[PDB]
Amino acid sequence: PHRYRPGTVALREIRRYQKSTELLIRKLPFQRLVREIAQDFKTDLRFQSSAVMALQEASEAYLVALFEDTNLCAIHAKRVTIMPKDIQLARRIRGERA
């Protein structure tokens, strides 16, 4: 066959996705999630296509940057693997969580 050691494709994908700027969430699932969340606020609502695009650009920028901080929190604990506790520490620090 042929097999790369665990972590080699992980690094190839980092180099790749840090090279590009295209969105990483599939557009329609995101769109359907945006409409779902909004319904619970006000019923019968339309969205400009650019309004969903703006929410996706922002949301993903937020998650990438949160993953950056989560990663530092993992590394701080001599780990290579991100865990829910690293995210929770990040947010606690960001002052999102209490």
Binding site: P29, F41, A51, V64, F67, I82
Partner: protein
């Protein structure tokens, strides 16, 4: 079930762009909750803006105004 539309490989790609090499199994659901909270907070504010404009369509500007409110200013959509 729509939240689950934010898939494992999708969260993985985001993590990769964030420089993450290895990802725990419990991270996927954790990121779904986090992203829900983020969107709730922003969409809530966006809708408050739409409401006030007496519209039925949420504009990019409503969102831009909401992102700004939340300290998450976004360039390229009507700033």
């Amino acid at each position: 079930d729509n939240i689950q539309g934010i898939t494992k490989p999708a969260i993985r790609r985001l993590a990769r762009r964030g420089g993450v090499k290895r990802i725990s199994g419990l991270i996927y659901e954790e990121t779904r909750g986090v992203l829900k909270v983020f969107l709730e907070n922003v969409i809530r504010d966006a809708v408050t803006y739409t409401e006030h404009a007496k519209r039925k369509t949420v504009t990019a500007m409503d969102v831009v105004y909401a992102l700004k409110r939340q300290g998450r200013t976004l360039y390229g959509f009507g700033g």
